[PDB]
Amino acid sequence: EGREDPQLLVRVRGGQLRGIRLKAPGGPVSAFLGIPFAEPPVGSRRFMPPEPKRPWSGVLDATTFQNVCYQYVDTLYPGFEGTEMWNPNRELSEDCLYLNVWTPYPRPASPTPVLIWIYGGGFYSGAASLDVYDGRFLAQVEGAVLVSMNYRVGTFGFLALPGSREAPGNVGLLDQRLALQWVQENIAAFGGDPMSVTLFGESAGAASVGMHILSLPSRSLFHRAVLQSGTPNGPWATVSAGEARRRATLLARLVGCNDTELIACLRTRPAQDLVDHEWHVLPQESIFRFSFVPVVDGDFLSDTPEALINTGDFQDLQVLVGVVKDEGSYFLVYGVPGFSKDNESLISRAQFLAGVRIGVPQASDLAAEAVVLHYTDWLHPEDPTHLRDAMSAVVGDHNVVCPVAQLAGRLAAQGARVYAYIFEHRASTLTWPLWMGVPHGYEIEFIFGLPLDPSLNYTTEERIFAQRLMKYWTNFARTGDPNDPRDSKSPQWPPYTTAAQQYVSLNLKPLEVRRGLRAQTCAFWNRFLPKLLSA
Amino acid sequence: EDPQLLVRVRGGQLRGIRLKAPGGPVSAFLGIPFAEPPVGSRRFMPPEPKRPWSGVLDATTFQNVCYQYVDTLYPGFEGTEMWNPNRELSEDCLYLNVWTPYPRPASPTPVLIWIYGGGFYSGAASLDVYDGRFLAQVEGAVLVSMNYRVGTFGFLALPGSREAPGNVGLLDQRLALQWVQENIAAFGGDPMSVTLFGESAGAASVGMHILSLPSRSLFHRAVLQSGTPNGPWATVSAGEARRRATLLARLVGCNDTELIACLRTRPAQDLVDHEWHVLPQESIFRFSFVPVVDGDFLSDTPEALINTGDFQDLQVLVGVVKDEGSYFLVYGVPGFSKDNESLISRAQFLAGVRIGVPQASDLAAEAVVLHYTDWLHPEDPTHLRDAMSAVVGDHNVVCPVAQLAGRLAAQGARVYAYIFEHRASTLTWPLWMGVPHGYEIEFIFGLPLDPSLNYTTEERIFAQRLMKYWTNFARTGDPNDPRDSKSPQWPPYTTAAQQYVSLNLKPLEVRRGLRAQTCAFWNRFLPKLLSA
Numbered sequence A: 001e002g003r004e005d006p007q008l009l010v011r012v013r014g015g016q017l018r019g020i021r022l023k024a025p026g027g028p029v030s031a032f033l034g035i036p037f038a039e040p041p042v043g044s045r046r047f048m049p050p051e052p053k054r055p056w057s058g059v060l061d062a063t064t065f066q067n068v069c070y071q072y073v074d075t076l077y078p079g080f081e082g083t084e085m086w087n088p089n090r091e092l093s094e095d096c097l098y099l100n101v102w103t104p105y106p107r108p109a110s111p112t113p114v115l116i117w118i119y120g121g122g123f124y125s126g127a128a129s130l131d132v133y134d135g136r137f138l139a140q141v142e143g144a145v146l147v148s149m150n151y152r153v154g155t156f157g158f159l160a161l162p163g164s165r166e167a168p169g170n171v172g173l174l175d176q177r178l179a180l181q182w183v184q185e186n187i188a189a190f191g192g193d194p195m196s197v198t199l200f201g202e203s204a205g206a207a208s209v210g211m212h213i214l215s216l217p218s219r220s221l222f223h224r225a226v227l228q229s230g231t232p233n234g235p236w237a238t239v240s241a242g243e244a245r246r247r248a249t250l251l252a253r254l255v256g257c258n259d260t261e262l263i264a265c266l267r268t269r270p271a272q273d274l275v276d277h278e279w280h281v282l283p284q285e286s287i288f289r290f291s292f293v294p295v296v297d298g299d300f301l302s303d304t305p306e307a308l309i310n311t312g313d314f315q316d317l318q319v320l321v322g323v324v325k326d327e328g329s330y331f332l333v334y335g336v337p338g339f340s341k342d343n344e345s346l347i348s349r350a351q352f353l354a355g356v357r358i359g360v361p362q363a364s365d366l367a368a369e370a371v372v373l374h375y376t377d378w379l380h381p382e383d384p385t386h387l388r389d390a391m392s393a394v395v396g397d398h399n400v401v402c403p404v405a406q407l408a409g410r411l412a413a414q415g416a417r418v419y420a421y422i423f424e425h426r427a428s429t430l431t432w433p434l435w436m437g438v439p440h441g442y443e444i445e446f447i448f449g450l451p452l453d454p455s456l457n458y459t460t461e462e463r464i465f466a467q468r469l470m471k472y473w474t475n476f477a478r479t480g481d482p483n484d485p486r487d488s489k490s491p492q493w494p495p496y497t498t499a500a501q502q503y504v505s506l507n508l509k510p511l512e513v514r515r516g517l518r519a520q521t522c523a524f525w526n527r528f529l530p531k532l533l534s535a
Numbered sequence B: 001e002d003p004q005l006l007v008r009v010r011g012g013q014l015r016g017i018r019l020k021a022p023g024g025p026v027s028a029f030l031g032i033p034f035a036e037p038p039v040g041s042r043r044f045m046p047p048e049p050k051r052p053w054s055g056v057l058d059a060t061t062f063q064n065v066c067y068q069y070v071d072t073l074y075p076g077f078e079g080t081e082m083w084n085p086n087r088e089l090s091e092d093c094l095y096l097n098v099w100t101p102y103p104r105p106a107s108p109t110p111v112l113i114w115i116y117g118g119g120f121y122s123g124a125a126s127l128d129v130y131d132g133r134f135l136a137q138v139e140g141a142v143l144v145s146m147n148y149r150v151g152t153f154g155f156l157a158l159p160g161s162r163e164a165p166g167n168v169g170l171l172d173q174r175l176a177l178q179w180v181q182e183n184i185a186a187f188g189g190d191p192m193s194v195t196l197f198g199e200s201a202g203a204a205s206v207g208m209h210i211l212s213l214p215s216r217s218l219f220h221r222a223v224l225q226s227g228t229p230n231g232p233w234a235t236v237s238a239g240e241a242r243r244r245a246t247l248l249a250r251l252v253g254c255n256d257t258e259l260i261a262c263l264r265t266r267p268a269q270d271l272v273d274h275e276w277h278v279l280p281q282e283s284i285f286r287f288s289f290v291p292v293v294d295g296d297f298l299s300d301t302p303e304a305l306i307n308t309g310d311f312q313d314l315q316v317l318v319g320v321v322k323d324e325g326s327y328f329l330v331y332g333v334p335g336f337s338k339d340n341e342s343l344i345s346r347a348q349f350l351a352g353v354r355i356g357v358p359q360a361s362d363l364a365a366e367a368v369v370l371h372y373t374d375w376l377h378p379e380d381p382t383h384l385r386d387a388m389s390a391v392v393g394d395h396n397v398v399c400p401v402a403q404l405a406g407r408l409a410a411q412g413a414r415v416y417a418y419i420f421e422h423r424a425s426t427l428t429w430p431l432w433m434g435v436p437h438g439y440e441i442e443f444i445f446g447l448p449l450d451p452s453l454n455y456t457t458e459e460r461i462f463a464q465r466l467m468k469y470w471t472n473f474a475r476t477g478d479p480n481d482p483r484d485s486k487s488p489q490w491p492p493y494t495t496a497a498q499q500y501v502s503l504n505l506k507p508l509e510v511r512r513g514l515r516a517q518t519c520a521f522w523n524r525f526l527p528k529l530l531s532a
C-alpha cells in the first residue's frame, strides 16, 4: 500500500481486495468487482457442485467485471439494443464464479441492509455485469450495500443425471448459495449487515429466489425476498428427474457420448459444442421453455415447488412479488409465426390457434381448445389486433402472471406477509415496438435507478419514478414493508391477502390499489387446467 | 242475436260473445273444437279432425284444460297458482279460442297464434295472462290460442309403434294451425299472414314447427320467448323416450301393442301420479314427457336441423328475460325458497350445479363451478345464489337462444333479438328472483291496460309499446314502427355484430353480444368435454 485510496482496501476471508471509486450522479460509490467466491468450475469440476475459493496471496485487483459464464448468445436481431442489452458484455468462460459489491463512499459507519441480486436469463444466460444491473445508484442514493453474483447457466449449471455423483443437478443454484454464504461471512467487512439480507431477482432469477425460500439450507442466509416476474412454481422453472435425465442423455448423443462414463465424455467436450446443441433437446416446439433448468432432485428441492408452496410454513417470511403489464409480448418473436419486432404482428385466427400450441406446448388438444375458447373475444373472434394481444396474454398468463398469483395466494394463506404489484410504465427509451406494451424485464432499469443518469435521456418524471421505486425496494429490504414510515400522506401499499387480494399499480401516477391478480383467468390456469390434465 | 257474434266455419255455426276491453268491445269465440276428443282408444294417438256439427255451437266459454299435473309447491300462492288450470281437467280438451275486433275486421287481418308453455307437462290457453282481448282491441289483431295435450297424453312415445308414435301434442298444435288456414278468413283473419308466438315449452314448440316441413306451409313468421327447440330439455332421443314410457308402465302395473293397451285402461290421474318418477337424474328444468326425435315430425335432432337448415324466407323474433333461472331453483335446489333471500353457501352451490346440470360429468360440473364463481368473492352468499340462477338460466334458455339466433341468422333468416329487463310492480315472487321466467307475457298481451290490476302508468305505456313491437313484427316481419322516424331502431341480429335490444321502461337501447363469452363455454367447450 502507500498511496492508494485507503477507502478501497478491504480484507475478506480469502485475502485482500482493491476496489474502485465510481462516480454516480450524486457522488462517489465504492465498487468491488470480480471477487472470486468459488474454485473455477473447470475441467474435472464441470457439472460439479462449487468448492469454496481457496485464499489468494497479495492484493487481488477488484476493479473490473470478471468473465461471464459460458452461455448461448442471442442472435435474433443482430445489432439491436433491445436484444444486445441482455447479451454478455465480458468474455465467456467456464471460469466465471465471481461476485460484485457496491457500497456507499465512504463505507457506512453502522451496519447497513444488504441487497443481493440474482439475474434472470431462462437459466441459460445472464451476467451480473450487465448495465441494467448497475448497483451504483442504489448504493449512492439509498445507501444500500448491493451484491450480485455470477452463477453457472445452461448445461454447465443445470445438466443433471439425477442420482449420479458427477452431475447431481442444480449446481447453478449451489453457486448462488455459496455466494450467499460468502455474504454471510464477509459482508460486514464492507459495512453490510449480514443479519439483514434481502434477495431480489427477475424471471429465472426470481425463480431462483423462490428456490432458496423452498430449500432449507438457504433459509438461514437471507431474511426477505423480492420476486420480479418469475416464480419457482409454474411450467418452465423446473423439470422432473426423469425429464432432466432424458435431456442430458440426448445432449450427450448429440455431441457424441453407466453415468460415470457418459459424464466423463461430456467433460472432454469443448464448452462451445455443448452450447451449440442446448436448444435441440426440448420435447416440443415451444416458446418460454429452456433446456437446462433446476431439477426436482429430492435434495435441493425435496419435492416439486408446487407441493412445497402448497404445504410449507412461511409465517416468518416477507415477500414482494409482481409482474409487468405485458409479460408475454417479448417471447412471441422467438418462435410464434406471425410475430416480429419489425411489424405490428397482426395475426389471423389460424396463426393464433397454431401459436397457442407453441406457447402452451404441454397442452393436449382439449386443453389447447379450452385456452383458445377462454382467450377468444367472441364479439370479434377474427380481429387481428385482439388475436395478437390474446396470444401475448396467453403466454404471459400461463408462464408468469398466474404462477405469481398462485405463489402470492399460497404464501399469504400460509403465514407470509406478501406485497404485490403490477408494473405498468413503458420506458420512453424502449427500443421494442409499441405493440409489445410494457414488456418483460423493462422494470429492472427503474428499480436500479438508471433514469438518474442524465446521459441516458430519460424524462424528469421517470427519474422521480425511479426514485420512488428505489425507495419501495430498499424500504422493504430495511423493514419488510415498502411503505415510507414517515410518509402517511402518500397512498399506502397494503399487503396481499387471500380475502382482499390487494396489489398496487406502479406507474407515473400515485399508488393505486387494485383487487385480484387476473382472478378469473388465473382460476382457469391454476384450478381448471390441472383438473383437465388428469383426464 | 248479434250478427257479429255468429260465424260459420267448415264444421258448422258458432256463436261467440262480445267482451269488454278498456277501449271498446271485442268478439271472442271460446272453446271451438278442432279435433275429435282424444279419449279411449285415441289416447296417445295422433289427433283427428272434428266432425261437423248441427245447429249453432255455443262458443262463449273456455273449454276444459288438458289433463295435467297441478302444482302444489306453494298452495294458494298467486305466483304459482296463476299457472295452474283455471278450468276443469279433461282428456277431452282439444279446443281453440279466437279473439277479433268488434265489429269484425273489414280487411283480412294478420293472425297471431299463441302456443302456451308449461314444460310440455302443463298449461292452458284459458289462463288470465293469455287473454287476447287487449291485442285484438288495441292493435286490431286476430288472436288464436289452442289447447294441446301435455304430459303422458301428449308426448308418451313408444317410438316406431303404431299406437304411441310420439309427438301427438305437437300434432295437436299443427291441426289447430290447419284449422286456422281453413277457417280464419271467416273471422276476418288473413291466412296468408300467420305469426306463431309462444313462451318456454311453447317457444320450443314454435321452433319445432320451424324445423318440421309439414308445419311450414301453415305460418309465415315466428316468435320464440325464452325457449328453443334445441337445448337440453325440449327433446329426448327415441331410446330415452322408450325407457321413460316403459318405466311409467311398470310403475302403474303394465311388445308395445299390449303395453299401450293396458296404459289406455288407466284413469288419467294414475298416469300423472308417476309422471315425475321416470327422470334419470335428480334435476330441475327437466320434464318427463317432451317431444321425441322420432325421425318423422323431427327428421333429426334439433341441433342437426338448425345446423343444416335453409331459413332464407323466414323472419324470427327471439329473446330472454333478465333472470331466466331464478324461478326453477325453488323446485329442487336445496337452500332456495320463495320466503327468504336464499343466500347459499359454496357447498350448496356445488351441490346445486349437479342438479341444475344433471347430465354433466364430474369434470364438466367442475368447469361450470369454476366459470361461474366470482374469484374475487368466491364464498359470498349473494354471489353464489345469483350464480346458481345464472347457471340454470344460461344452460337451459340464454345459450340455447343464442345458438339458435346465430344459426338462423347465418343461414338466411331474419332475426330480431331482445332481453326483457323490467320487473312487474305487481310481482309476488321475492326480489332476489329479479325478472323471472314468464313475467314478460303479461306485458305483451297487454294486461297493464286493465286499470283494476293496479299496474303503474309507466307499465301501461310500456305494455303498449311491446304490443306494437309484436304486432308490427306480425304485420311485416319487422318490429319497428314504419311511422316512428326517431332513433334508435331495433336492428336485426347478425353473426357479425350480434345486436339485440333491452326491453324496459327506458327507450330501446342496442347491445352487442348475447352473453357471448359464457355461451361460448356452453355452446363450444362443454360439448367437446363431455364427449371425451
Ligand SMILES: Cc1ccc(C(=O)NCCCCC[n+]2ccccc2/C=N/O)cc1[N+](=O)[O-]
Binding pocket: A074, A086, A120, A121, A122, A126, A202, A203, A279, A286, A287, A288, A289, A330, A331, A334, A335, A439, A440, A441, A442
Ligand atoms: C434459439 C433460441 C433463442 C432464444 C429463445 C428464447 O426463448 N429466448 C427468450 C429469452 C431472452 C430474454 C433476455 N432477457 C434475459 C434476462 C432478463 C430479461 C430478458 C429480456 N427481457 O424481456 C429460444 C430459442 N429456441 O427456441 O430455439
Ligand SMILES: Cc1ccc(C(=O)NCCCCC[n+]2ccccc2/C=N/O)cc1[N+](=O)[O-]
Binding pocket: B071, B083, B117, B118, B119, B123, B200, B276, B283, B284, B285, B286, B327, B328, B331, B332, B436, B437, B438, B439
Ligand atoms: C314436481 C315438479 C313441479 C314443477 C317442476 C318445474 O320445474 N316447474 C317449472 C315451472 C312451472 C310453472 C311456471 N310456469 C309455467 C308455464 C309458463 C310460465 C311459468 C312461469 N315460469 O316462471 C319440477 C317438479 N319436479 O322437480 O318434480
Ligand SMILES: *[C@@H]1O[C@H](CO)[C@@H](O)[C@H](O)[C@H]1NC(C)=O
Binding pocket: A337, A338, A339, A340, A342, A343, A344, A345, A346, A347
Ligand atoms: C411481420 O414479420 C414476420 C417476419 O418477417 C412475418 O412472418 C409476419 O407475417 C409479419 N406480420 C405482418 C403483420 O406483416
Ligand SMILES: *[C@@H]1O[C@H](CO)[C@@H](O)[C@H](O)[C@H]1NC(C)=O
Binding pocket: A455, A456, A457
Ligand atoms: C441522448 O441525446 C443526445 C442529444 O444530442 C444524443 O446525442 C445522445 O446520443 C443520446 N443518448 C442516448 C443514450 O440516447
